[PDB]
Amino acid sequence: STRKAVIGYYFIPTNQINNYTETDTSVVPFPVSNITPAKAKQLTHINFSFLDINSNLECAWDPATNDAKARDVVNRLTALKAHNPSLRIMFSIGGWYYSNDLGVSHANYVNAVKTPAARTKFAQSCVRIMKDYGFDGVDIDWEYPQAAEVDGFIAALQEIRTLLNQQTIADGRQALPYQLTIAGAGGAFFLSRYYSKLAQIVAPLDYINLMTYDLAGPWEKITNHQAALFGDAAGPTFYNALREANLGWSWEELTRAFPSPFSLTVDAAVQQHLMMEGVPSAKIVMGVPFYGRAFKGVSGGNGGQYSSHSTPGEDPYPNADYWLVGCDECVRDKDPRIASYRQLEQMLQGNYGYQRLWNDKTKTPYLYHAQNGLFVTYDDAESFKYKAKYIKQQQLGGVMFWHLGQDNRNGDLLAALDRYFNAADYDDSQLDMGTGLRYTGVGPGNLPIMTAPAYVPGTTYAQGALVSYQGYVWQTKWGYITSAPGSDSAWLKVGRL
Numbered sequence: 061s062t063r064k065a066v067i068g069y070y071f072i073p074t075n076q077i078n079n080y081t082e083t084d085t086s087v088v089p090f091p092v093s094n095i096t097p098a099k100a101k102q103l104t105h106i107n108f109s110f111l112d113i114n115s116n117l118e119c120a121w122d123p124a125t126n127d128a129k130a131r132d133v134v135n136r137l138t139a140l141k142a143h144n145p146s147l148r149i150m151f152s153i154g155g156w157y158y159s160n161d162l163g164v165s166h167a168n169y170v171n172a173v174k175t176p177a178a179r180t181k182f183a184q185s186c187v188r189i190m191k192d193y194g195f196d197g198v199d200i201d202w203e204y205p206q207a208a209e210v211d212g213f214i215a216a217l218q219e220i221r222t223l224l225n226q227q228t229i230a231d232g233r234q235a236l237p238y239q240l241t242i243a244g245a246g247g248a249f250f251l252s253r254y255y256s257k258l259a260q261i262v263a264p265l266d267y268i269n270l271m272t273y274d275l276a277g278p279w280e281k282i283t284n285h286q287a288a289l290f291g292d293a294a295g296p297t298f299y300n301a302l303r304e305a306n307l308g309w310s311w312e313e314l315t316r317a318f319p320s321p322f323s324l325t326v327d328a329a330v331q332q333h334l335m336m337e338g339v340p341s342a343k344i345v346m347g348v349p350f351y352g353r354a355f356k357g358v359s360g361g362n363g364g365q366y367s368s369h370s371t372p373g374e375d376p377y378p379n380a381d382y383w384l385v386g387c388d389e390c391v392r393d394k395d396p397r398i399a400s401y402r403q404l405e406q407m408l409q410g411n412y413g414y415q416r417l418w419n420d421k422t423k424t425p426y427l428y429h430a431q432n433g434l435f436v437t438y439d440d441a442e443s444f445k446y447k448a449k450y451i452k453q454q455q456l457g458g459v460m461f462w463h464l465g466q467d468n469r470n471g472d473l474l475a476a477l478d479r480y481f482n483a484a485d486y487d488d489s490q491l492d493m494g495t496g497l498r499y500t501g502v503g504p505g506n507l508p509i510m511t512a513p514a515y516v517p518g519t520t521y522a523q524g525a526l527v528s529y530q531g532y533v534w535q536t537k538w539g540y541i542t543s544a545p546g547s548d549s550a551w552l553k554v555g556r557l
């Protein structure tokens with residue numbers, strides 16, 4: 061029954077708002093009018109981005125924003141709701157530029173959530189902005205609160221939730237209640253900052269939208285897929301930072317939940333969330349990229365995968381060599397390292413020297429330019445079949461993507477996602493999910509159903525013996541054990557009845 065969420069970011073920089081126009085793509089490449097009624101029907105949420113937190117510790121527009129122009133842009137988005145009574149226009153606070161550890165507004169994020177009074181003032185500003193501009197909910201994209209700030213962040217979400225609920229009552233919006241989401245880490249290293257308190261983070265949210273992309277980039281030594289669904293044993297692996305989180309678990313519990321090293325994949329991030337007690341699968345949304353990440357200086361042999369590379373990691377892109385052959389948008393944006401799916405289609409179609417290759421373990425496409433040594437990791441309508449099937453099988457809440465302007469003109473990526481979830485005639489029952497590496501971790505939140513003989517008092521159990529007892533299946537960690545399962549540290553809870 062329940063419709064999967066389809067959450068698309070609409071990003072527009074301040075300069076484009078201030079010069080907003082729907083008839084000049086060299087000024088605004090992707091105006092609201094490109095979101096046609098058909099696209100609007102295929103979305104459940106549009107996340108308008110980005111607002112910020114100012115030094116007054118309130119949610120605010122960038123202060124250079126022309127306010128009349130901003131209201132006009134937002135009004136155009138909310139007018140889309142005429143075509144889809146399920147559709148919400150959220151607004152997002154944060155993003156990497158504003159909120160990263162070294163970002164321009166970082167201290168405002170830290171300070172806004174720091175004390176009860178600050179949280180109240182911040183929470184109020186969020187709901188006030190929401191009402192003033194006509195938004196339908198609040199998305200927080202702070203990348204990322206550090207373990208010490210996590211309790212404040214949690215209390216801030218709780219308080220926003222209460223104020224949103226009041227507003228839903230005041231406006232009689234029970235048919236479309238005001239919502240709260242966050243953009244969550246999609247890889248273990250950032251996730252470990254708040255992982256131990258994941259259940260408290262998710263409780264106040266309608267959805268946690270996993271940034272399950274940007275898992276490879278120029279900061280890594282070796283090229284890799286940025287959003288592999290499953291792992292490739294030929295690919296790099298990473299230290300599992302979650303095993304060092306402050307969980308209070310035992311060695312066996314830690315080891316069973318957090319294999320290490322592990323493959324940095326979409327399935328890993330999803331499973332890591334599901335392992336936590338009190339994190340329901342319906343609130344987890346899988347992010348996907350509508351862009352590819354490009355690398356230069358790559359060697360041959362494996363289509364450019366898992367190769368050293370000479371891609372600058374600095375920001376801004378440090379020179380004017382725009383080496384991603386055929387990428388016109390790269391020239392416009394002065395950066396050959398990111399290419400929209402829209403542009404990648406054109407690069408494939410023109411005489412630019414790319415081959416489209418497919419990794420059947422990761423279930424993702426990549427471009428390889430044999431002559432110049434280039435590699436591009438991206439997603440398309442094919443990789444989205446496997447991802448949508450995974451979303452259905454794991455009973456996730458839906459899909460999120462960055463960003464709407466990166467789909468092709470016909471919006472084929474959005475239309476594919478919508479089709480995989482909702483088309484009566486689409487059938488993926490035979491879609492083969494392949495033999496790529498699954499994240500095998502098990503934690504208190506995802507115990508498999510098991511059976512085993514009932515525990516018998518007085519029996520001496522050898523190491524590895526399985527019994528059932530009080531709702532669960534238990535395994536001895538050593539032998540010989542005679543204690544009742546769960547009464548001391550000799551038994552590992554491994555499954556549920």
Ligand SMILES: CNC(=O)NC(=N)NCCC[C@H](NC(=O)C[N-][N+]#N)C(=O)N(Cc1ccccc1)Cc1ccccc1
Nearest residue numbers: 069155156157201243271274277278351373375397398462
């Ligand atoms: C909804 N929120 C998000 O999707 N957030 C998000 N992806 N955060 C990760 C940000 C890292 C940043 N990513 C991109 O630029 C992806 N863009 N697209 N499409 C990133 O790669 N870098 C940090 C950065 C980005 C922009 C401005 C300053 C810093 C490093 C980088 C390396 C190579 C090219 C571009 C950026």
